Design a protein around this ligand. Structure first.
Ligand SMILES: *[C@@H]1O[C@H](CO)[C@@H](O[C@@H]2O[C@H](CO)[C@@H](O)[C@H](O)[C@H]2NC(C)=O)[C@H](O)[C@H]1NC(C)=O
Ligand SMILES: *[C@@H]1O[C@H](CO)[C@@H](O[C@@H]2O[C@H](CO)[C@@H](O)[C@H](O)[C@H]2NC(C)=O)[C@H](O)[C@H]1NC(C)=O
Ligand SMILES: *[C@@H]1O[C@H](CO)[C@@H](O[C@@H]2O[C@H](CO)[C@@H](O)[C@H](O)[C@H]2NC(C)=O)[C@H](O)[C@H]1NC(C)=O
Ligand SMILES: *[C@@H]1O[C@H](CO)[C@@H](O)[C@H](O)[C@H]1NC(C)=O
Ligand SMILES: *[C@@H]1O[C@H](CO)[C@@H](O)[C@H](O)[C@H]1NC(C)=O
Ligand SMILES: *[C@@H]1O[C@H](CO)[C@@H](O)[C@H](O)[C@H]1NC(C)=O
Ligand SMILES: *[C@@H]1O[C@H](CO)[C@@H](O)[C@H](O)[C@H]1NC(C)=O
Ligand SMILES: *[C@@H]1O[C@H](CO)[C@@H](O)[C@H](O)[C@H]1NC(C)=O
Lengths: 404, 68, 184, 35, 49
C-alpha cells in the first residue's frame, strides 16, 4: 500500500592508464654493447611495441565508446525547477571553474627510465561535458533523445511514462507529488552523505589504480636485480671483467630483463582484457539504463528500474540508480475468478482482492481498490470448469443508465 | 612524446609538442587521435581542439509537449 | 621471422651447425637455439590464446545479438541500431557476421501544449495509453510516438481521485458517446 | 470471440486499407435500449 | 611432471647435483634448472590466469 524510492550507486571501471615502454632505453639505456647484443635475439621489440600500441588503441576505443553515445551536446536550462525535484547535487555548478558536479568533485577528491605515460585522448573536461549532456538529455527529453531528435517532454510526463512502463497505471503519482519529491531529495541527500562515508565504497577504481602503479613499480624495481651476475650495472661489468665473462653476464642480465618485460606485457594484456570486458558491461548499462528503461529485474539497482543518471569519474564511471521498492505491505484474501449469472469473470489487468466483506479490483503493485465493473472485466467459458471461483455480483452501468 | 622541445610552426600540447602543423581557433571533427583532445587532420596539416558535437540547445516547458 | 634469428648461437641454420660442430659444443648450441625458439613459441601461444579468448567473447556477443534481434524483437533501446528496433537481417561474412538493423526513427517534430489531466464534473480524467495534446483551442489524445488526434471519449479515459490533489489540470468537457446514442 | 466494439477501434475510412473485407460487426447494448 | 625434468642440466636431483659437481659449474647448472622451473611456473600461472 506504499512505495519508497531508494538510490543505489554502482561503480564500473572504464579505462586504465596507457603505458608505453622503450626497448633499448629500459634494457640498455646508454651502453652500445647491449644495443649490439640485443640484435642477436631477433625481433623481440617490434612485437611488444605493437602489443602496447594495440592495448592503447583498445583503451582509447573503450573510453570513447562508453560516453560518446550522442551526436549533440545538450544544454541544461538555467532554471532548476522541475516540479519539486531538487536536481542540484548532480547538475554542473557554474561557481566552480572546472564544470564539476558536487558528486563528481566528491568522488574525484576520494581518488588518488624508459617508462613513459601516454595521456588519454579524453581528459576530465570533455567527459564531464559528455556526462552533463547525457544528464540534460535524460532530464528534459526523456528516453526519446537516445533514438532520434530530442522532444521537449516535461519531467512529470516522463516519470509518469516510466511508472506506466513497469505495470503501474498513472493514477498514483499526481496525488502525492510533494511526498515523492521529498523522498527523492532525501535519497539524494543520504547517498551524497554516505558516498564518502566509507573508504571502501570506491573499491574498483582504487584497486585498478593501485594495481597499475604497483605494476609499473615492480617493472622499475627489476633494474636493481643482479640476475645471477656480479652486479646490476651495465658500465660496471664491461669496465672491470674479462669480455668473454662479461658476455655471459650481460647475456644473463638481458634475458632476465626480457623475461620480466614479457611477464609485465602478459599481465598488462590480461588486465586490459578485463578492463575491456568491464567497459563493455558498463557500455551496455549506459546504453540501456540511461538512454531508456530496462525491464530486467536486478540489473540496475535492487528493485524496479525507473531511471538512472551518469556521473564522470576518472578512468571509470559511477551510476546513480533510482529504484522502486514497494515496502509496507498489507495482505488480503483473493479468488481467481468471480461467478455471476452462470458465467465466469476475469480481471483485465489486475487481481480480485477482498478485504473480508466486499470485493475489489486493484493494480498488481499498489492497493487502489475499485468496484468490479464490466468495462475492465471479460467473460470466458462457464462457472464449472474454473476452480476456486466465488459467488459475487458485478456492477454494470447500463442498469442505472437505461431507467434514468 | 612528453618532451619540452626547447633544446631541439611549433605548437605545445599536453602530450608533448607538435612540429609541422599550425593551430586553428575553430574546432572541426577529427579522425586522427593524439591525446589531451588536440586532434590533427588535413584540410596543409592543421591541428585543432576536438569538436564536442553539435551545440544543440533544446527548450523545456512543464506545460508543453512535442509529438512527431 | 624468428627462425632467422641467431639467438646468440653460431648461426641460424641448424643443419650447418649440426654438420659443422662436435656434440660437446653442438649440445650447448642446440640447447640455446631450442630454448630461444621455445620461448618464442610460448609467446606466440600466449598471444594466440588471448586473441582466441577475445574472439570467443566477440562471438558470444554476436550470438546473443542474433538470438535477440533475428529470432525475435528486442524491446531495449539502442541494442540493435540507433533508434527503435523492429527486426534485422543476418548476412554471411568470411570470418565474421554482418547484421542489417531496421530502425524506427521519428522526425518532423511539432510544438504542442499539454496537461497532466482534465477535470470534468468534479472528477479528473486520465487516458489509457496516450496524453492530452492541445493545439490551442481543443484538446485531443494521441500516442507517444506518432500524432493521431482523437476526441476525448469516456472509453479511453478513466477517473481517479478528486479535482484538488491533482495539479496542473485544465477545464474541458468529455464527450460521452452513450448520451447521443440513447437520444436516438 | 464475436467481433464487437469493445475489442475493436475505428480509424480512417474504407478507401485506403489494402485487403479489407466486407463484414458486419456485432454491437453491444442493442437488445437493451429498445427493451 | 615438469618438476622431475633434467632441463638441460647434468641431473634433476638437488643432492645429486650439489655434491658431485664443482660449485663453479654446479651453480650455473642449478641456475639453468631453476630458470627452467621458474619458466614452467610462469607458464602454469599464465594458463591459470
Ligand atoms: C538542493 O539541495 C542542495 C543541498 O542542500 C542545495 O545546495 C545548497 O545550496 C545552498 C544555496 O546555494 C548552499 O548554501 C548550500 O551550501 C548547498 N549545499 C550543497 C551541499 O549543495 C541546492 O541549492 C538545492 N537545490 C534546490 C533546487 O533546492
Ligand atoms: C454459488 O452458488 C451456486 C448455486 O447453485 C452454488 O452451487 C451449489 O453449491 C452447493 C454447495 O457446494 C452444492 O451443494 C450445489 O449442488 C451446487 N449447485 C449447483 C447448481 O452448482 C455454488 O457452490 C456457489 N459458489 C460459491 C463459491 O458460493
Ligand atoms: C485545433 O484543431 C481543431 C481540430 O481540427 C481545429 O478545429 C477546426 O477548425 C476548423 C477551422 O474553422 C473547422 O473548420 C473545423 O470544423 C474544426 N474542427 C472541429 C472538430 O470543430 C482548430 O481550429 C485548431 N486550432 C488551431 C489554433 O489550429
Ligand atoms: C508512505 O510512506 C511515507 C514515508 O515513507 C509516508 O510519509 C506516508 O504517509 C506513507 N503513506 C502513504 C499513503 O503515502
Ligand atoms: C472493506 O471495504 C469496504 C469498502 O472499502 C468497507 O465498507 C468495509 O467495512 C471493509 N471491511 C472491513 C472488514 O474492513
Ligand atoms: C617548457 O620550459 C619552459 C621554460 O623552462 C616553460 O616556460 C614551459 O612552461 C615548459 N613547457 C611546459 C609544457 O611546461
Ligand atoms: C514550471 O512551472 C512553474 C510554476 O511556477 C514555472 O514557474 C516554471 O517557469 C515552469 N518551468 C517551465 C520549464 O515551464
Ligand atoms: C517550440 O518552442 C520552443 C520555445 O518556444 C522553440 O525553441 C522551438 O524551436 C519550437 N519548436 C518548433 C518545432 O518550432
Amino acid at each position: 500500500t506504499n512505495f519508497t524510492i531508494s538510490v543505489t550507486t554502482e561503480i564500473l571501471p572504464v579505462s586504465m592508464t596507457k603505458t608505453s615502454v622503450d626497448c633499448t632505453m629500459y634494457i640498455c639505456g646508454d651502453s652500445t654493447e647491449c644495443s649490439n647484443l640485443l640484435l642477436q635475439y631477433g625481433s623481440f621489440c617490434t612485437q611488444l611495441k605493437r602489443a602496447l600500441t594495440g592495448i592503447a588503441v583498445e583503451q582509447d576505443k573503450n573510453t570513447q565508446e562508453v560516453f560518446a553515445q550522442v551526436k549533440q551536446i545538450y544544454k541544461t536550462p538555467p532554471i532548476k525547477y522541475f516540479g519539486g525535484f531538487n536536481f542540484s547535487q548532480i547538475l554542473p555548478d557554474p561557481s566552480k571553474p572546472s564544470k564539476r558536479s558536487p558528486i563528481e568533485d566528491l568522488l574525484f577528491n576520494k581518488v588518488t627510465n624508459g617508462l613513459t605515460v601516454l595521456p588519454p585522448l579524453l581528459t576530465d573536461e570533455m567527459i564531464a561535458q559528455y556526462t552533463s549532456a547525457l544528464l540534460a538529455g535524460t532530464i528534459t527529453s526523456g528516453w526519446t533523445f537516445g533514438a532520434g531528435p530530442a522532444l521537449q517532454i516535461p519531467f512529470p510526463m516522463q516519470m509518469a511514462y516510466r511508472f506506466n512502463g513497469i505495470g503501474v497505471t498513472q493514477n498514483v503519482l499526481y496525488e502525492n507529488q510533494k511526498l515523492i519529491a521529498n523522498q527523492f531529495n532525501s535519497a539524494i541527500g543520504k547517498i551524497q552523505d554516505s558516498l564518502s562515508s566509507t573508504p571502501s565504497a570506491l573499491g574498483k577504481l582504487q584497486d585498478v589504480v593501485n594495481h597499475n602503479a604497483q605494476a609499473l613499480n615492480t617493472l622499475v624495481k627489476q633494474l636493481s636485480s643482479k640476475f645471477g651476475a656480479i652486479s646490476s650495472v651495465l658500465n660496471d661489468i664491461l669496465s672491470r671483467l674479462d669480455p668473454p665473462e662479461a658476455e655471459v653476464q650481460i647475456d644473463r642480465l638481458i634475458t632476465g630483463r626480457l623475461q620480466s618485460l614479457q611477464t609485465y606485457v602478459t599481465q598488462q594484456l590480461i588486465r586490459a582484457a578485463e578492463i575491456r570486458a568491464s567497459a563493455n558491461l558498463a557500455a551496455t548499462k549506459m546504453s540501456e539504463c540511461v538512454l531508456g528503461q530496462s525491464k530486467r529485474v536486478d540489473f540496475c539497482g535492487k528493485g524496479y528500474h525507473l531511471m538512472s543518471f551518469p556521473q564522470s569519474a576518472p578512468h571509470g564511471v559511477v551510476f546513480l540508480h533510482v529504484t522502486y521498492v514497494p515496502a509496507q505491505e498489507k495482505n488480503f484474501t483473493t479468488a481467481p475468478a468471480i461467478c455471476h449469472d452462470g458465467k465466469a469473470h476475469f480481471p483485465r489487468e489486475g487481481v480480485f482482492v477482498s478485504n473480508g466483506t466486499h470485493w475489489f479490483v486493484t493494480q498488481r503493485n499498489f492497493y487502489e481498490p475499485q468496484i468490479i465493473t464490466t468495462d475492465n472485466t471479460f467473460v470466458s467459458g462457464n462457472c464449472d470448469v474454473v476452480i476456486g471461483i466465488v459467488n459475487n455480483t458485478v456492477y454494470d452501468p447500463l442498469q442505472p443508465e437505461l431507467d434514468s | 612524446q612528453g618532451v619540452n622541445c626547447t633544446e631541439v610552426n611549433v605548437f605545445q600540447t599536453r602530450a608533448g609538442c607538435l612540429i609541422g602543423a599550425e593551430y586553428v581557433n575553430n574546432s572541426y571533427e577529427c579522425d586522427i587521435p593524439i591525446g589531451a583532445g588536440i586532434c590533427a587532420s588535413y584540410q596543409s596539416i592543421i591541428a585543432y581542439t576536438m569538436s564536442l558535437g553539435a551545440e544543440n540547445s533544446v527548450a523545456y516547458s512543464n506545460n508543453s509537449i512535442a509529438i512527431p
